[model samples]
Target: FSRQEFFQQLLQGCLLPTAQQGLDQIWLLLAICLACRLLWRLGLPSYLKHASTVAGGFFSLYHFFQLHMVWVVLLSLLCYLVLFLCRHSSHRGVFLSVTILIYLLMGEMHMVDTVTWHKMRGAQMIVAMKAVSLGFDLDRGEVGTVPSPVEFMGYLYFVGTIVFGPWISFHSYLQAVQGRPLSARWLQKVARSLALALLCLVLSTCVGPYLFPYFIPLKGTMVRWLRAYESAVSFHFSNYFVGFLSEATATLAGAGFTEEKDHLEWDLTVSKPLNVELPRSMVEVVTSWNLPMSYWLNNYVFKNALRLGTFSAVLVTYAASALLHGFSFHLAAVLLSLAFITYVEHVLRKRLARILSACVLSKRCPPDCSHQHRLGLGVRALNLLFGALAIFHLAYLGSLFDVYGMAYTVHKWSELSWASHWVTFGCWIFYRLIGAAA
Candidate 1:
């Protein structure tokens, strides 16, 4: 088969079947365990964890042994056994352990096929797992309880919004799931979401192909104009508008589940708006913005680094995130850059807020506030202008990375000349002004 056909078949047939098979086994095991645990009143986290490890290890070994079909059947059988055994144990640790073990096994198996993995790696799975885990834990008095598995699963695999999530919370998920079924409100959301997704797909596919390449070559006035346009479009579509519309549609359609709290709690700890009754913290906002992904980091990496302070948490979290992407230098660089950016944004915002507060307290006409406000405006302008420039450079950088490898990224930095910098800066200013007007 041709490359495209192979990819299509692999996705539609092989990968989908594998994922569904895995999910089915997992769900059956979960159901059996839940029933058994409730009956026996066993609550041993350790036993549960151990049981999962053994079962998962067995499956992994079986796959390695080239007994692929047998492995699936065995997995299903094991799940049934787990359900039967669960009724006798006082502890549910085995359930948690098994879930995690299955995740690791499935993750590795999925990775063996990149194309299948990419399509399957939607935000839904992460959300679903988190919601279900939380629900199960809560039911066992291990954590706060969600209402039901159906609710949890709904939140976890909410179809309409999973493709682009802002990462809703378990609490929000519960509310959405519990609300009335599909109605006029929900249908409107579906329409909006489909329209937005299609529009973005079309525009990005068309302009991105052309603009991405041209932005790299031109460096003068023309480059500036092009960069500005790219920025405006990317910000509106990729980062904000389309993403917002997709999420809104999911919320209205009630097709998938919603959560009351993000899996991670970033927004809860860092980004929540300040209130006189209950002041919000900076940490909440940072954590809550993308709850599922952030939750993964916290559960898998950051919480373990709490003893190391903020810097360590940032570094370790970034490193872990990058490693999860398969340990490439480019991935490393991206993680590091993201970590640094997060740290800087957090620290700077806090400090700026402090400085502004102090100025206001002094009753000094709040000069700092005014100046900072102006600075904020300037920063936004620069973001718009430089953001656009970055887009073009990003497009070129992507192509360069493909064509010349990492050497191109390294060379671009080393070969930076004064004239080039000046020209680039000039183009940035020009783009900033034109982009603002446009």
Candidate 2:
């Protein structure tokens, strides 16, 4: 009876009730994606194939969000209209900024009920990514013309990625619609990805909570620290769950593959759990967290701002990411801290490399590194020490992600004494001092 009661309560608080709805939606999305694959098999016209996708996507959206889906549709249409109008204008960047402004405004105006808004915020982020990337591609002359409404809408609401997204490019979506030949190996790969996603979900909702605060019987101040680490680890697992889930859906939807002559490989990877869990640095963790989104940000936001300077572009990219996530104080705090953590970590490691003449850079150096002590014991130990520190910083920064509003976030950080922030600042100071000494 005691075991039964514990089992019954194991999943409580670890998962939101809306998550059940989201899971049901993912199954429905898979059905829609399979139907598109069938349409391709039927040799239907490409326009009809894309139109059917748009319809299927809308149906899923409506099934989940009801009228709240209207906001996403309206935003898509607004972006489409802007793209259509600005196809000839050299100032195509306006479309990107204006779309962001309009999205920000919708939130500021309390356009949707707060509960619904919170639940559907992810969909908005996905749409914003699609719209902005398309506009920037046009700006770069990579896309010769704005897509017709049918194609544009299909890409925007593509069943595979419209919800739990990794944000594929327009070209990638088009390729998905065109179809890929399937095989036993492909089936095995997708099955493996789905299984991995399930494992992550279990880790997030089942093991993490029970193992951390519940299982451990620590007393005094240590209990507080354990709970904080528990929350952070649980949050990390949930992210990995989404990452793998996105990978599975994207691949099963007939995307995320590279096809060369006589060879087809499903190379759709959304997260690298190993790199994150045993991180080289926070920079590596950030890049591997959601790879496609990171790629999108790098291509669309970071590169464009590079003319302003590397440091400026880094800040701009982080700011853009925070804005895209919506105007939440907790999220902004996390992102800004990450920006500083990564910057300080990078600079500190760079300085260490120069001081020791060892290969202790944040990113591993190539085989031909100038450092004579490459891959030596001292270099490996130094890098390993930094990786352990990175894990600590991740735990501290991720502890406050439990959506309990800004007050809860602030309260928790105060409990941790804002140690991550202090460490980041101290690292910056250390880097400066070392450089000056040199």
Candidate 3:
């Protein structure tokens, strides 16, 4: 039927594609890349390929979803007009982003066509990121020579990230535009990325569809526990699938390459499935999960919002992330739980490390002290304890991922009798009382 109807079905059931309908888009991407590659082989300026790439990305959005990409185009151009041509402060850029997103998030509840809403939510977040970054770049005088609409739009709408994204920074965009020296080894490195991605894709595709209550017994005595584990694994796999697709997109586009450790690196990575699944602590879990987004929050929100204090900055970043992802209460609750665990974990670990060090040296080292030079039985024991706890909380929080409505999120948590949250709360309470009592 209609593309809108097609997209509505796309957003349903985990927002993941279960068939060749999704795989065809991958070929579409490669075809566009090949055209760009051949075009560049003809000695044309690289800018043309960049333009064609974004053009194709937008075309896909239109063809698949009938989405207009209204805000990304309109607001980015408007932002360029105000900040670049009209000469406004970078803070105004921040204000514009915050304003539009607040409206978009608030208005989501009113959407009758969820396909349209999901489309807007995804595109607008990327648009907001690009607009704010562009403004800051201009404000910092990094734009040295003003660009034409072609250059600016290409950078803003770079196809590698237009739909699915890891939120490439404006600086990174400019760096890609400038081009780089490459090594013959580069192609082999890209092979690793593709292999890892496909492995994840095949595993998830085969195993994920097999997991659920129908496939699982309700009276397993670990019904919710098994469910939570499978949910997180499935969620991680879905993310892994898209994440590597983005990486391969960068490889095909010949963009997002950066020099790291004397080798060319494609810097479009968004998730770390391995580390995230087995994290050392909540802090590591949050930090490593979606690395590029973590960098965005750290750079734009956390670092910039530092007047709020470090812990508050972390909370503010999570709040911003909750909105950026969409203003669902379920999302908000998950992020808040994450924030609490991270903060409490940080405080308790620091306090215990200090108390142990004092018993050893009769002197409290600085609050930032790390016994990197020395790890005793106590320090090692604490490490193992925190690691185990982080994995459990991750499963419980991740159980909410596949679920949609607030009721679903709540019911899943209720199945575990809210044990994860209460443990987090309990630890926080004990941390507070112990300090107050002493």
Candidate 4:
């Protein structure tokens, strides 16, 4: 055996060169964040400090995307102009419509056709969230006043988040530019998060693929089901990969800290894998899947649409989320399906909790619930059952993401027999029956 060749082959198999290049770019961006942090330490004028961040952020964008950076710059300008002109306006309705229109047009124009843009769709989402939230903040008077152009640009193009973001608010961006307190704990947390992120990346790229058809023999009737599971698992890990990466970058840039009493904590959680992996319910799983985006959806979309009734509001929220991910039938179908599944789960669980006098809601009950069966074996078993149900639905929902084309997506779901739809509908009918019995 050639020992050197064995090692080389092993290394190549372990780390994909294609993904490695992207990781390398992310590494450089982190270095850029460090430089921004160092530069901010100079205690210069506020304008200059903000300028440093803008320069660092733009330089990163330029490096990764040569002319494509122009799109983001134009977007920033549009956002800034809206804030400036609407300074006296009561609400941000105009700004909201205009920004969303521009975003959809950008997609329609085939800007997303570029591989780079497709990969950076997350970044586009981050920018859109920030811009939309800024408008709402203005309307609510939460922002007090429009920021200066430099500050606006800096917030929009923050070095830590402009690339692969889990969307931070303008207030957080301001605090980050001013620098948060550093500690041994902060350093420890950053190291932990970065390590976990890398591990997720490795799992997504290397380990997950081998576990399915490779590990399992290819001849069984269960092979297709296993393959579907494999696809969902891989997709989950990839999401966690970015989740932890965003968490690490935000913490490293001094943004994700909270001050409590006498101590500061870095607790910018982007995803809760444990809650998702061992899900209590689809409601909890969806919230934990992407915590910040969930918050964005709730704060901006759901709450504003509350006038239409609870059910309608939830539908609108899910619809808006699908729109943000771009107008793909596959994603729209997945999100729409998720909306119904979670609704059915929530209602059915709520009715069961009342009927059984147990603490078995879609959300976990606190320790001091008044229900008689709060800690009983029956309730525990029911919760576990619900958890299993959530997993089944997750596998079905996530399976759609691995395939790209609309026709292929339809075919893949057909292969699964559209079981999730039937299951969710059955649950809804069961929920209505429980209500009728009351």
Sorted by lDDT (best first), the order is 2, 4, 3, 1
Score every model by TM-score: 0.47, 0.92, 0.82, 0.92
In model 3, which runs have C-alpha deviations exceeding 4 angstroms? 1-22, 37-43, 46-50, 85-92, 106-112, 140-147, 181-184, 209-221, 260-263, 358-377, 433-438
Model 3 lDDT tens row, 185-256: 445544666666666775465455446533343344387777787777777787787777667666555566
Residue 363's lDDT in candidate 3: 26
- lDDT for model 3: 0.66
Lowest lDDT block of 10, candidate 3:
356-365
- Which lDDT tens digits does candidate 2 get at residues 1-438? 244576677666444443464466577777776676667667778889788888887997897788888888888888888878887886676666676677766775786677777777778888888888888887878877878889889889888887886798889888888888777766777788777887787777766766654455444556666776777777888899888888877887788888778688888988999888889999999999889989988998899899998778888889889888776777788888888888889989988998898998888899887887886889888889899888888878877864266788789888888888888888899899999999
- lDDT, candidate 3, at 49: 56
Model 2 C-alpha lDDT versus the unseen true structure: 0.80
Instruction: Give candidate 2's root-mean-square deviation (CA, Å).
Output: 2.9
Q: Report residue 256 deviation for candidate 2 (angstroms).
A: 0.6
Cα-based RMSD of candidate 3 = 6.9
Per-candidate clashes come to 46, 0, 0, 0
Best by lDDT: 2
Each prediction's whole-model lDDT (CA): 0.41, 0.80, 0.66, 0.79
Error of 3 at 55 (Å): 2.4
Model 4 per-residue lDDT tens digits across residues 309-366: 8889999999889877776777889899989988889989988998988999999788
